[PDB]
Amino acid sequence: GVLITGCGSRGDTEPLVALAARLRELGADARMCLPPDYVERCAEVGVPMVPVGRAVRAGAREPGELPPGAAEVVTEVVAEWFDKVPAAIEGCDAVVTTGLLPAAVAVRSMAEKLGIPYRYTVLSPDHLPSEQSQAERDMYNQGADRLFGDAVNSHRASIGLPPVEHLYDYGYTDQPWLAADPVLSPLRPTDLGTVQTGAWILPDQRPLSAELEGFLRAGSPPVYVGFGSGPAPAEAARVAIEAVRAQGRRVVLSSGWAGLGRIDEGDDCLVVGEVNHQVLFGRVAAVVHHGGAGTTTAVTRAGAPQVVVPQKADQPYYAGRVADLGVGVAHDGPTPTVESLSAALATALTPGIRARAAAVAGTIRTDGTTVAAKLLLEAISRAKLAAALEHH
Ligand SMILES: O=c1ccn([C@@H]2O[C@H](COP(=O)(O)OP(=O)(O)O[C@H]3O[C@H](CO)[C@@H](O)[C@H](O)[C@H]3F)[C@@H](O)[C@H]2O)c(=O)[nH]1
């Protein structure tokens, strides 16, 4: 089998589910360890998953219950991963991981014990160890060792392993994979070490809800607005609904983890939960979003013009990439006003940008999981999988 693990938000998780599903299609018994948020997602695509640790979404936890990434609970997190992974990793020939470092180091430790290959994956190039300075890498290693090195070493001893240090190096490996699209996220030409597979995208077969289908059929193509797993700006729903209205468009508002909702009973708005983005984004006039790696990838592949309203982290990078590609507008700042978002939307709604977005869509590859599957085949070899890939 192959074990696929991670602890993080939807963006950290969805690529892993894509890889797991692709491996199962290719005849490999891929299974997962993920936070409990993702039980439904894994089940609906037929991927076995074992829930590990605290829920990542605040609303999925108890009031006052700290997230898995909180420094206060790191000892508990390490223990939980060492407790639950053994049953899942048994009979596996390789492991692929992303996300939270203390969990990743636990997983690699168990891979080390079994003598099976471990691969860590990053989703945005700015997060590659080789894109950090030596001083930064030193700092990350020291912080990890200090914060949870003792806990990791106690559990390593429990299974007979020697102690380990430099936990950033250990968890990320010396050369993590980059599961990111090369058009959206080009790698510097001097980097010969990083294996860039392309994005890991699950071909989405889920139907749209009757309500969303009805909404799409009942009028002109709407604008989608959503902020993914992250926070939304102040008055996000009001500003977005009023700005989209100002452009003469209907609105599909994704509630997201922020829990956005309607501002009135207007029938020109539909509030949605989880949806098939691959299908929906082909049927909208534009997408206003936060600039998450996965969301940007999906919007770009669908060919919908964009307005990126970046909140934090790697999101300004994606806003800049979208602007540079000419397929959308990088909104100036994290908190739009009706006026600023309306202006950005007007720009994103031109025939020219529609054509540019349509053209760039065709350049985004969707076969990154096949690249990763072949890389795994080669790592394990050093059957059904080899036969399936030869067929491809
Ligand atoms: O209704 C829905 C909602 C989502 N999806 C899919 O979930 C994926 C979300 O990916 P994304 O990377 O934007 O995740 P997110 O957790 O919001 O963002 C961060 O995690 C990212 C990765 O680390 C990071 O780039 C960023 O800064 C984050 F905040 C993407 O493939 C969507 O198309 C869906 O199919 N239907």
Curated annotation (Swiss-Prot):
It comes from the Bacteria. The keyword Glycosyltransferase applies. DTDP-beta-L-4-epi-vancosamine binds at residues 9-11, 206. Pathway: Antibiotic biosynthesis; vancomycin biosynthesis. It is an enzyme of class 2 (transferase). In A.orientalis different glycosyltransferases are involved in biosynthesis of the vancomycin group of antibiotics. GtfA, GtfB (AC P96559) and GtfC (AC P96560) are involved in biosynthesis of antibiotic chloroeremomycin, while GtfD (AC Q9AFC7) and GtfE (AC G4V4R9) are involved in biosynthesis of vancomycin. Belongs to the glycosyltransferase 28 family. This is dTDP-epi-vancosaminyltransferase. It comes from Amycolatopsis orientalis (Nocardia orientalis). The chain holds residues 2 to 214 of 396 of the full protein.
